[PDB]
């Protein structure tokens, strides 16, 4: 049926791609929802997700 209708296929594709992007890079969604529950997924000490200015 996603071939019977075109824009339906594009709609579903866009939703799937939105999710996969949320996997690739942290995406901003609102902010804090309730009270600060805590970083639900874990803090990693030794990762350093930042871009370094080389010489």
């Amino acid at each position: 049926k996603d071939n019977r209708n075109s824009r339906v296929k594009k709609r579903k594709k866009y939703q799937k791609a939105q999710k996969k992007l949320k996997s690739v890079r942290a995406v901003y969604s609102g902010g804090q929802s309730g009270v600060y529950e805590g970083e639900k997924t874990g803090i990693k000490k030794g990762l350093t997700r930042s871009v370094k200015f080389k010489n």
């Binding site: 690739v24 890079r25 030794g46 990762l47 997700r49 010489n55």
Partner: protein, 167 residues
């Protein structure tokens, strides 16, 4: 470690056996889209680019206006400027051009004068520029980077590659 010892141990081995840093992906990028390059653009000029432009008689600023149908702010870094200088007397015309009041110069705190390396770093870091060149090695490295438009000079006027909105 004799030769027969090594052969025997290889035989026995066969018989027996049978802080980090991972840079964040830019917040500009849809999967390869780079939704942060809206007109007026910012083009990092390169030495090869200046010289080929002189060869094919296309103005810099009006040429990029033609190619993109937008405004293009061109920028020349210190290693690009110094490379033209060292090129020397035969390229006096390219330098009197590149040293134009409209080519705004962005400086750098980096070692030596190797514009390739210096450029590739800029675009690894920021992803709001578009690189201009005709250099094959730099072209390959910049294509390897995702979502960085590449404006070469070719034919009779500039061509642009990874812009979704070439038109």
């Amino acid at each position: 470690a004799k030769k027969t010892r090594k052969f025997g141990l290889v035989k026995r081995t066969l018989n027996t056996k049978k802080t980090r840093n991972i840079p964040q992906v830019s917040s500009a990028l849809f999967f390869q889209y780079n939704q942060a390059i809206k007109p007026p653009y910012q083009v990092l000029i390169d030495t090869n680019f200046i010289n080929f432009s002189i060869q094919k008689k296309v103005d810099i600023v009006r040429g990029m206006m033609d190619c993109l149908l937008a405004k293009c702010n061109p920028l020349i870094t210190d290693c690009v400027m110094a490379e033209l200088e060292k090129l020397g007397p035969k390229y006096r015309i390219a330098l009197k051009l590149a040293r134009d009041p409209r080519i705004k110069r962005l400086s750098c705190s980096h070692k030596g004068t190797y514009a390739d390396d210096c450029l590739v770093h800029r675009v690894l870091q920021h992803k709001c520029y578009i690189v201009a060149t005709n250099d094959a090695g730099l072209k390959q490295r910049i294509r390897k980077i995702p979502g960085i438009p590449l404006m070469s000079v070719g034919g009779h006027a500039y061509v642009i590659e990874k812009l979704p909105d070439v038109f």
